[PDB]
Amino acid sequence: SKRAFELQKSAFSEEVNIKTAEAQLAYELQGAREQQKIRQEEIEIEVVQRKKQI
């Protein structure tokens, strides 16, 4: 009985840990995805500036 219980508990812990591990790093994934556009505009700043430095 102890073996059956431990096997089932470890099996459940497998996917619960998988889902958690996705959960923490979804934040970083979306943060980088947004930083793409953030830096795009932060660098378009001086593009616009140098356009009229002409």
Add this chain to the structure above:
Amino acid sequence: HDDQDYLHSLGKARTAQVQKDARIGEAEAKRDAGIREAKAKQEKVSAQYLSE
């Protein structure tokens, strides 16, 4: 009265012969208690893990 311990051993023989019965009864009782105590322990643990 015997000061040579002649009759004390003759008395002690039957005391041993009854003490063997005294021990056999205790052995019966202990085995009979332990068998079903362990079995009931087994069922309760099995059900507890089933609930877990």
